[model samples]
Target: MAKKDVIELEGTVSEALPNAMFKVKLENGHEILCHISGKLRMNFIRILEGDKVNVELSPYDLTRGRITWRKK
Candidate 1:
C-alpha cells in the first residue's frame, strides 16, 4: 500500500473494544475506529474511553487508520 496522508485530530475515545481497539469521537464530528500499533500494544499502554488521543487518518479511507499516539 502507498503511504497514507495522515491528518492529526484531537479526539476522545468513546468506547473501548476488545484487543486494544477504540471508537474515537473526533472534534470534527467524525467517529472512527482506532487501534494502537503492535509496538505500542506491547508496552501495555492502557487507554480508556474518554482518554484523549492523536489519530492518523488513512488517506484512501478517512475512517480507518492507527492511533499513532496518545496524550497524557
Candidate 2:
C-alpha cells in the first residue's frame, strides 16, 4: 500500500491552547488548530504564541494539523 499523503504549510502561532495544542495562522491566512509532534514533545521543544511553525494537515481535515517544526 502507498504511504498516506500529508499537506504541509508554514504558519505562525496565533493562540496557545490547553494540552499542548495551538491555533496557527497559515501564511495563506487560514487558521488551524494543531497539536505538538511527539518528537518535539519528547525533546522538550516548546511552542509559544507568535512563533512561526510548520504544520502538517491531514488530507481528511484541513481545520486541524500536527506541528512538526518550529522556526526562528
Candidate 3:
C-alpha cells in the first residue's frame, strides 16, 4: 500500500477551544479546527491564542487537522 503525504502548513492560532481542540487561521486566510493529541497531549504542549503553529492537514478533509508543532 502506498503512504499518504500530509499537507504541512503554517498558521496562527485564532481561538483555543476545549477538549484539546483549537481554531487556526492558515497563512492562506482560511480557518480550520485542529486538535492536539498523542505526543503533545502527553508532554503537555500548551497552546495559547495568537500563538503560531504548524498544522498538518489531510487532503481527504480540509475542515480539520492535527497540530504537529508549535512555533515560539
Quote each prediction's TM-score.
0.78, 0.87, 0.85
What lDDT does each candidate get? 0.78, 0.85, 0.84
TM-score of 3: 0.85
Rank by TM-score, highest first.
2, 3, 1
lDDT by residue (tens digit), candidate 3, 1-72: 988887888888899978878899987888999988698667776778899988888888988887878864
Query: Relative to the unseen true structure, what is the C-alpha lDDT of residue 6 in candidate 2, on a scale of 0 to 100?
Result: 93
* Residue 50 Cα positional deviation in candidate 1, in Å, after optimal superposition: 0.7
**RMSD per model, one decimal:** 2.2, 1.4, 1.5
The clash count of every prediction, one per candidate, is 0, 0, 0
How far out, in Å, is residue 55 in model 1? 0.8
- Candidate 2 runs further than 4 Å off: none
Better of 2 and 3 by TM-score: 2
Model 2 TM-score relative to the real fold? 0.87
